Amino acid sequence: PPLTSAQQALTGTINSSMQAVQAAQATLDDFETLPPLGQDAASKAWRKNKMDESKHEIHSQVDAITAGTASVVNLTAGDPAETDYTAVGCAVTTISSNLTEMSRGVKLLAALLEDEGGNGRPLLQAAKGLAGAVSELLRSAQPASAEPRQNLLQAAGNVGQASGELLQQIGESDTDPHFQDVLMQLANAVASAAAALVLKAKSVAQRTEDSGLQTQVIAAATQCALSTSQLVACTKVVAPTISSPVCQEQLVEAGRLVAKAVEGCVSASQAATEDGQLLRGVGAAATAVTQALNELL
Predict the structure, then answer these.
(1) How far apart (Å, rounded) are the C-alpha atoms in residues 99 and 122?
(2) C-alpha torsion 44→45→48→54, nearest 10
(3) Which of 175, 198, 225 marks a domain boundary?
(4) Closest by alpha carbon to 4, among 91, 89, 87, 85?
């Protein structure tokens, strides 16, 4: 079906934002020209002032890119008609304007490492990584696109990754590294616990007593995977942050999409009820429910 007005409007927002991401991207070519200073009084502690202002601005701005990209992921999870297209549009504009701001800061900062220290071109390098990454997230956000869903998922997790390697450059990185890898593994115990669930539902419902959903037990099992698959992407995107109270809000909000996809999975099976196959659903269900409790810490 052709996009609705709300959808067309979101498109015009992604379009404006994609255009600004392409501009900021075209800004990360060289360093911001600095007025050669010297050990001159003021000058000497200018490289430190401006280094530190921008080193923390970058931070806050990456924080809003990740939060917003977790937010776009969560917001579009719905079904076109339960989707709030102004909120997602708002999230995209937040990603957008923050990337434009972070670029100014990086041109400047990277130039102070390039003069004062030695080489600070890996900063412009990291920044293009992110920009480029948020461009791939915006393209998948286009409501008239076929992908499917997993394509937006990957692109968002790539945004997290590029944010990590970026904040790592500027050493602005609050989350005890590898604690991130504990997050990454803890979110994958939820996915595999889920494949078990999606699995146990293949069984029930290839015994579904003549159809009727049958096709809802599969539909429900498929939503389980996809919601779980979304938790993984979000964990990836918010990990380099998680210090930020809002990435956390989003992270637990994807947990809720998971709990719901899970519960929706047991009632589909039970509507097709009776057997020992049923006890198994609840078991796998207990499993994913427990696995996710863990990662929610």
Answers:
(1) 17
(2) -110
(3) 175
(4) 85
Same domain, 132 and 27: yes
Cβ atoms of 238 and 160 within 8 Å: the answer is: yes
Do residues 105 and 54 lie in contact, with contact meaning Cβ atoms separated by under 8 Å? yes
Method for this entry: X-ray
Are 53 and 164 in the same domain?
yes
Peptide bond into 245 cis (omega under 30): no
Per-residue buried b or exposed e for 2-11, using 16+ beta carbons within 10 Å of the residue's own CB = eeeebbeebb
Amino acid residing at 72 = V
Give the position of tokens 């060289």.
Answer: 30
**Type of residue found at 95:** I
Q: Is 79 left (phi over 0), alpha (psi -120 to 50) or beta?
A: beta
CA atoms within 13 Å, Cβ hemisphere of 141? 35
Amino acid at the residue 146: A
* Domain span at 105: 1-175
CATH of the domain at 81: 1.20.1420.10
Residue 214 sits in a domain of what CATH number? Answer: 1.20.120.230
Rounded Cα distance between 208 and 269, Å, is 9
Tally of domains in the chain: 2
Q: What are phi and psi of 91, to 5 degrees?
A: -55, -40
